[model samples]
Target: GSSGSSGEELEERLVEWIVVQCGPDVGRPDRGRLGFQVWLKNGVILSKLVNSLYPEGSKPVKVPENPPSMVFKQMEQVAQFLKAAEDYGVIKTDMFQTVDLYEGKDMAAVQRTLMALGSLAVTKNDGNYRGDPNWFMKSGPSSG
Candidate 1:
C-alpha cells in the first residue's frame, strides 16, 4: 500500500513547530488527521499561529479570546488567518480555503498551508521563528 507516512511526519513537525510558536495555549492533538479537525477546525489557533509571525503591536489577524460558537464566525476566523498568512509571505497556491479547515474537507491542504508558512518564516530568518531549521524548506543561492 502506498501509505502516507511522509504526510504524517510533516504533520508531526508542523504541529510541533506550531506549538512551539504559539506556546502551551494551543493544545497538542492526537496522532491523526482527526486531531487537526479537533484542534484547528475553529481557526482560533490558525489565526493565532499566523499572528505569531508578526510583532505584537502589528499582528495581522484579530483572533478572539476564545473559539467562536457560530459556524460562520469560525469560518470568518479561518478566512482571516488565510489572508494574514498571505500577508506574511505564503503564496496563494500554497494556501487552503476556509472550508478546508472549518469543514475538515482537506486536512492535507491545511497541513500544506502551515508547512509553507513555517518554511517561509524560517527562510526569512526573522527572530520570531521558534522551530528547528531542518523542519522546513530553506531558500538557497540556487533558488535563482
Candidate 2:
C-alpha cells in the first residue's frame, strides 16, 4: 500500500508506479485521465498501477483545497462493480477479495488516490464548478 498522510505523496506514488511499469514517458498531467480509467476497471490493478508509478524518495505534492470525494466515489463504484463481477463469476472471487486486502493494508492509499483524482474533476480551478455530496447525486442533470 502506498497510502500517505499527504495527497501529493499518494499521487506521486501513483505517477511513479505508472512510469516504472508503463515507462517514464508517462506524465503526471496525464495520470488523472488514464489512471482514473484503470481505477474504474480494477482497484487491484489500480494498486499495482500506483506502485509502478512511484519509486520512493519522491517528494509529495500539496493537498488540493477540498478532499476529492468524487474520486472516492469512483473507487467505491469500482469496488461495488468488482464485487458484482465476482458474484457473477465475471472475475474470480479472489479478485474481489483483493480490494479488501489492499484497502486494509493502507486505507489511505486507496482513499488518497480517489480523492486526488476526484479533486481534479470537481475542483473550481478545473472549471467543473461542482461540489461534493450534490456532485454525487444520480438524479440531477448536473450529477457526476
Candidate 3:
C-alpha cells in the first residue's frame, strides 16, 4: 500500500502547501480566476522543486507532445487505477472539454484540462472524481 499511502501524503502536503501559501485567500471563488492563474504559475515553480528533489533527473521540463484523444486515453487508465485503489466503487462517463485558447493544439488544451481536473480533485461526493497521478505518462500514437 506504499503507493496509496504516498499518494495520500502527497495530496495532503499539496493541500497544506496551498493553504499556507494562499492563506485566507484560498477558499474564495471570487478569487478563482486569479487563484487558477496563480496555481498554474506555481505548478511551474513546483515542477522545479520536484526536479530538485531528484538530482539525477532534475531538469526543468515543459509540456509533453500528444493530441487530446491520446492524452485522455492515458488519463482514463490512471483514473481507472486510482478508482480501484481507493475502492471508490463506481465508473463514470469520460469528461472532456475543448479549449478555444490553444487554437487547436495541446498546450492550451492541457492547461485548461488540468484546471478543470484539479477542481474535480478537490470536490466532495462526486462520482466522476479521480485522484491525480504523481506523474503523467505519454501514450503511443493515436489509433485513429
Candidate 4:
C-alpha cells in the first residue's frame, strides 16, 4: 500500500498544453441554452470574435452561451500548430488586442493572455480569407 511519497511525485505533473474550444453549456436535470422543453434557449453571447473572422459568407463558428474553455493538455503540439497555422497563412491575426501566444507558461493568467491574443486574431484586412478562419483567427492572416 506504499510506494510511498515518490509515487506522489507523479501527481505533481501538470498539463503543459491546452485546447481552447467552445460549446453548449449543460446543466443538471436539464440543459442550458438550446435545451428542449426543459430549457428553451438557442444561445447567448454569440462570438463576435468568431463571426467577424468569417469571410463574410461562411457561417461563424458556433458556441453555446458559454465563452470559451481551456482544456489542459496531453502536453500536445499546439505551439507549432499555431505557428504552422501562421506560417501557412491559415489565419490572419489575433483580435485579442495584442495578446501573445507564448507569453505565459502557467494557467489562470496564461490562459487569459492566450485568449486575449485569440480575440485579436480577426479580420485586420477583412475575412476575405476563404481557406480556414483559424489562420486569421489566431495569427498571420492580414496585418500581423
Candidate 5:
C-alpha cells in the first residue's frame, strides 16, 4: 500500500492518522492498551466513518476518542445514519450491529481509507513503543 518495498511508509502514514485522530494514550501498542480486535474495529469503524460525511456540526461521536480531528465530523454522519437505522431495525439502540450491516465481506488489499485508518490501528498493535505518552498531543517527533 505504501508503494515501497517496506511497510515503513505505510506504517508512518498510519501513525499520522492516529496522531491526528486518537490521542497518545491509545496510539502506541507498547502501552499495553491495544489488540487485534481493537485494531479491526477501529479500522472498520474509521473506514465507515471516513467514507460517510457529516454536516460539520450536527454529529458528534466520542471515539476512536482521540479527539480534535475531522473524525468527529464522520461521527456525526454515522450518528445520523444509526438513528435512521434504528428506525428501520437495522441496528440496535446502542448503535452496535444487531443485524448484518452488510451482506458480504468485500476484501481489498487495502482500502485507501481503511488502509490509512487501519495502518494507524495496526501500528497501535505493533508492540514497539518507548513510552511516548504525549506523542499525540505533543509537537515533538513525528514517529510514534
Candidate 6:
C-alpha cells in the first residue's frame, strides 16, 4: 500500500511529486511519454526541483534557460542536475545518465531517480520536502 508501484504508475506519481516540488511554474506534461520527455529534457525544471530541496539562499544549481539551439548547453543543464542530486544524497547509481534523460533512451531510470530523491527528501524530515510526505513513507509491516 505504498506509492512504489512500478512503470507508468510510478511515472505518474513522480510527475505529481515533481509538480509539487518545482511549484506551479512547472506545468504537467500535456501528452504522455513524449510530453514527459520534452518537459524534463530542458533540465531547467529539474534544476528548480533540486534547488527547492536546499535551504534558502544555499540552492546549489544555477538553473539555466532552455537553449535555442545549443545541444551541449542543454545537456550541460542535465548534467548539473545529476551533480546536484548527488550532492543532495542520491547515490550515484540511483541517478540516470544525462543522455538517458536528454535522449529519452531510458526514462524509466529518470522516474527511478525522482523516486529515490523523493524518498530521501522525506527521510531527511527537512522542511525542504514540498509534497505529501506520506507518498514517500514506507508502510510498516505491522500497523502497531
lDDT per prediction?
A: 0.75, 0.37, 0.31, 0.28, 0.34, 0.75
User: lDDT tens string, model 1, 43-68?
Assistant: 88888888777888898888767678
Task: Find the number of clashing residue pairs for candidate 2.
Answer: 9
**For candidate 1, which ten residues in a row score worst on lDDT?**
1-10
TM-score of each: 0.84, 0.23, 0.22, 0.23, 0.29, 0.82
Task: Give the residue spans of candidate 5 off by over 4 A.
Answer: 1-6, 30-56, 60-108, 114-144
The candidate maximizing TM-score is 1
Off by over 4 Å in 1: 1-7, 31-33, 138-144
Runs in model 2 deviating more than 4 A are: 1-6, 30-144
The stretch of ten residues in a row with the least summed lDDT in candidate 6 is: 1-10
lDDT of 4 by residue, 12-124 (tens): 21110111222233321133421121111111111322343444555334433443334232112233233333432334432111122222222232233333334344334
| Residue-level error in angstroms, candidate 1, position 48 | 0.8
- How well does candidate 4 match the true structure in TM-score terms? 0.23
Candidate 5 has which clashing residue pairs, if any? 22-66, 59-76
How would you order the candidates by lDDT, starting with the best? 1, 6, 2, 5, 3, 4
Estimate, for each residue in 80-111, the C-alpha lDDT of model 6 and write its tens digit.
Answer: 88888888778867798888788876777777
Off by over 4 Å in 6: 1-7, 64-69, 138-144
Candidate 4 structure lDDT: 0.28
Task: Tell me the deviation in Å of residue 132 in model 6.
Answer: 1.3
Cα RMSD for candidate 3? Answer: 15.7
- Model 5: weakest 10-residue lDDT segment is 98-107
- Could you tell me which 10 consecutive residues in candidate 3 have the lowest summed lDDT? 96-105
